[PDB]
Amino acid sequence: MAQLKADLSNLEECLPSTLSQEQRAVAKTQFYKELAEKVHKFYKGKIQIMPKCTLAGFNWFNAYYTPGVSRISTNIRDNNDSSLFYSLRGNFVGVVSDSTRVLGDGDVTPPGGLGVMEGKALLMKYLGGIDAVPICIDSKNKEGKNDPDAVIEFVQRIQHTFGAINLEDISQPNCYKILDVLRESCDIPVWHDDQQGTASVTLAGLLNALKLVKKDIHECRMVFIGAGSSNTTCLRLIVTAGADPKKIVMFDSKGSLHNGREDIKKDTRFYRKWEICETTNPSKFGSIAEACVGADVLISLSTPGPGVVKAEWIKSMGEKPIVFCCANPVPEIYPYEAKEAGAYIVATGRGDFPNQVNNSVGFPGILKGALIVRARKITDNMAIAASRALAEFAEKRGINPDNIIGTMDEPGIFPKEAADVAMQAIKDGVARVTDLTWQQVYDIAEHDIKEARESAQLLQDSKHIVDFPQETLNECLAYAINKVTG
Amino acid sequence: MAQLKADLSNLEECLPSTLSQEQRAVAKTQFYKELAEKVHKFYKGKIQIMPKCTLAGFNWFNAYYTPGVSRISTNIRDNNDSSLFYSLRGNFVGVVSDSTRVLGDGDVTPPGGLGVMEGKALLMKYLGGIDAVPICIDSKNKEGKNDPDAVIEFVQRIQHTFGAINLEDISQPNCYKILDVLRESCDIPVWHDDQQGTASVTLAGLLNALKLVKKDIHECRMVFIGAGSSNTTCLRLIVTAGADPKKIVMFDSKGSLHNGREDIKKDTRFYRKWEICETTNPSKFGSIAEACVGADVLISLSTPGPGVVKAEWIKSMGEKPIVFCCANPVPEIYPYEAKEAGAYIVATGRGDFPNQVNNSVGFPGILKGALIVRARKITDNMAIAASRALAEFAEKRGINPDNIIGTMDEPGIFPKEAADVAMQAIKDGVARVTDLTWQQVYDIAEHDIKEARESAQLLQDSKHIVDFPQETLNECLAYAINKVTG
Ligand code: NA
Ligand code: NA
């Protein structure tokens, strides 16, 4: 009977009432997987390059090209900073990955990260008014090992094209060295989305969840399952934001993190883990299950599910448990099971369940802010300033257990983030532009965003972007429904 | 007196009658440099990123991003070639430069090449239907010398992002090593626009120039001023197309090329000049002036900086001299100086003089053709096919001493280049897509270029690209005039 609308807004209604809750969840994930396959091929990707300058007539090329363009090359040679306003550089972000950790799918090979990086680049334009491209590279050295110095050298060479570097999907602990070095060696800001960007949105999420459960951040026990770059960065911001590290426990694959973890202390590449080891889990919990009894908050970024976070764990938590399970493409548990177990607030990293806690609602504002005041780097306080803007944006339009965080469907989030991030950067002493107010940044970010969204809509109404075929949609739903019944 | 039109078509008439020929030439140069400065700052560059996929509703992000995008990650991992259609890669060109030979300005530091590489990317979209971005890199090693191996390594790592690589503005002999190695090692086509690109359009102009003066290619004495990477490739294509090597002389800084250059002999980084030493200029001409008397064709692309072509060399040439002076931003001699000295046909690299012999009129068509049928390499044959296509397109609508070649205002040149280059790639055995006909390839090129042009036009007509202020046009004019009248 039911048929998807072109805007996909009625997917829930098109899934037969006969499916179980695990069948709806698995069908949702199969639909979007099969649809991704079809849509990417239909349009041959997701982004394109366009003029943004007047093409009124042939002779404009004499100013864009020879002979006129020569003044640009000499102006830049003599004053490198003018590359920021004479070329797209000022608004141009490289989305650099070696594809070693592309979502929960792992090392997907060097071109393998294109779908994800191209999606980041798309969201940067449409959400953030930022021009960005995917830069998927091979970081393998001559011995066939993915090598942090290969990526460091690369970015140092390519920095001159860009206004910021946005590292993505790089396995740990390479990603720490890559970022720790680049961030101080480059003349443009470099950061790792998976680090402060995930951490930023995770905090923003927790901030509002804590207002809805009426607890103070400092009194809350919190369990962190998985100890990769996202989770370690989340814990760090959460503590800076007022959480008591003594009430916190993190787990890697070998057990809990604590004083006695000599395996972690001796390998300094894992210094972020080792700091957590020195400062949290004073009780040295041996198991997740013990750690969760009474816990207030469970934050997971581990192996893709099903069944990695256990219903029993959640059942044993305190009053109005907050559960974030953000592994991709499949969360550690589906939201219907966690609510069955008693969770009051459940978040995942995907857009097809409520409460999407995903850096896509953080990077565009963090990046745009940093670009506008030319911040030298992305500081933790900047990241936190964006956590606050996002949490406050959502609160001020209404929040509840099934809507705790700003969504990708609310463009207003991003100039708010950009202006707060910009002022924090001036405050932290890392901005090179200091002559702009909160309002002036907001206005710049707002305009670029509106201009980006109106251009792209115009190109859709006119059918330079062709409508996707109704029939391929019908085919993706049948495909999804067949997988979970047949 | 007239003010400049929005479309810049009437600059000649806005330049005062009383100006001398020298003043008029210099004032055009200064006008376009000063307008380049103003317009690049006005739009903060020339190109932008834009969605090319449907954004009909929020849930679409679930296909473009987590969770759906994971299908793309794994699809690519298991079939790397599918990257060419599940992402922009299949139509994505990197304009790679170390900014070491950027026009006649030469080495402008790494970010200094951005003006020129952005104009190239702007042209690939608007003339060729190609998505392209500037990639300006630092190639300097620790000792601060430009290192070809750095460029080789860099491109090898980034190749995974792109459907082709378009090397630009790399100093010789580095450009040879980089091109020659990369074209064999990368799994996409790599070429150097200043090599086959420039030689493609140079041959095209020569073809029509020769028709106009009624001379057979093989019966012309040709003198080449400069042994740079452009001129070298110009000579080589012009020989393959049928010139007599015995009737040809090339000059470098130290005098004519001939088989007695021990000089060039053992430095095998310069093997291309060496092949030319073995095969040309049997006579051992002892000065450019000795060479030029009775010559038919004189071709210079001195890079960098200002080259020399003398009035007296031209005056000594034969019946109806053909003179190409393509140095940018100022040619070796201006057209009116070459005309006064007896030249019948004169080309420069600029669009503000007749007969613009510039790669911008060959690269959009070459790359587009190569991209469609997935050519592994850009062969010399393929470059030559584009030349015949360019020259024949021009001859069909009429050629004359002041209009010998197709212009950037004639968008039909490029689907025709694309289809001829494609067929040639199949014939050369470098095409990975072998069963499309000329018409099928033409159709794809034409449809892409038309979509790109109309998309761009819609964005201007809509005011998303703002009209450039008339007041600033008027200022640039006055500025230019003022520079020349004091
Ligand atoms: Na969610
Ligand atoms: Na010209």
Automatic annotation (TrEMBL), chains A, B:
<dbReference type="GO" id="GO:0004470">
    <property type="term" value="F:malic enzyme activity"/>
</dbReference>
<protein>
    <submittedName>
        <fullName>Malic enzyme</fullName>
    </submittedName>
</protein>
<dbReference type="InterPro" id="IPR037062">
    <property type="entry name" value="Malic_N_dom_sf"/>
</dbReference>
<dbReference type="InterPro" id="IPR012301">
    <property type="entry name" value="Malic_N_dom"/>
</dbReference>
<dbReference type="Pfam" id="PF00390">
    <property type="entry name" value="malic"/>
</dbReference>
<dbReference type="GO" id="GO:0051287">
    <property type="term" value="F:NAD binding"/>
</dbReference>
<keyword id="KW-0560">Oxidoreductase</keyword>
<dbReference type="InterPro" id="IPR051674">
    <property type="entry name" value="Malate_Decarboxylase"/>
</dbReference>
<dbReference type="InterPro" id="IPR012302">
    <property type="entry name" value="Malic_NAD-bd"/>
</dbReference>
<dbReference type="InterPro" id="IPR001891">
    <property type="entry name" value="Malic_OxRdtase"/>
</dbReference>
<dbReference type="GO" id="GO:0016616">
    <property type="term" value="F:oxidoreductase activity, acting on the CH-OH group of donors, NAD or NADP as acceptor"/>
</dbReference>
<dbReference type="InterPro" id="IPR046346">
    <property type="entry name" value="Aminoacid_DH-like_N_sf"/>
</dbReference>
<feature type="domain" description="Malic enzyme NAD-binding">
    <location>
        <begin position="195"/>
        <end position="426"/>
    </location>
</feature>
<dbReference type="InterPro" id="IPR036291">
    <property type="entry name" value="NAD(P)-bd_dom_sf"/>
</dbReference>
<dbReference type="InterPro" id="IPR045213">
    <property type="entry name" value="Malic_NAD-bd_bact_type"/>
</dbReference>
<feature type="domain" description="Malic enzyme N-terminal">
    <location>
        <begin position="44"/>
        <end position="183"/>
    </location>
</feature>
<comment type="similarity">
    <text>Belongs to the malic enzymes family.</text>
</comment>
<dbReference type="Pfam" id="PF03949">
    <property type="entry name" value="Malic_M"/>
</dbReference>
